[PDB]
Ligand binder design. Sequence first.
Ligand SMILES: [Pb+2]
Ligand SMILES: [Zn+2]
Ligand SMILES: [Zn+2]
Ligand SMILES: [Zn+2]
Lengths: 36, 36, 36
Amino acid sequence: EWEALEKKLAACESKAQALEKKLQALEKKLEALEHG
Amino acid sequence: EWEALEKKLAACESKAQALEKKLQALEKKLEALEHG
Amino acid sequence: EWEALEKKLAACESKAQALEKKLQALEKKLEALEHG
Ligand SMILES: [Pb+2]
Ligand SMILES: [Zn+2]
Ligand SMILES: [Zn+2]
Ligand SMILES: [Zn+2]
């Protein structure tokens, strides 16, 4: 359980970093529409 | 504390899954505007 | 390690709350375009 929890937390942190980049990518496309 | 930490990690993982789906839903609406 | 894990989990939870607010902010701008 302890080692499984360490790995689950690292996976959740990784997923948050990937979601922040996806949000930046969608913001870029939104801004092109807003200022087009 | 240990059992509280397990539950807090599961809640954070759940929230990440719900945020990924919300991002997909916003991407779908953005793509309809971008290709309309 | 245990105390470092507690702090890493709190940081991940904080990041999720900030990403939810960023998603709401992008949704607001998207909705203005969709209903403009
Ligand atoms: Pb987390
Ligand atoms: Zn703008
Ligand atoms: Zn597109
Ligand atoms: Zn709408």
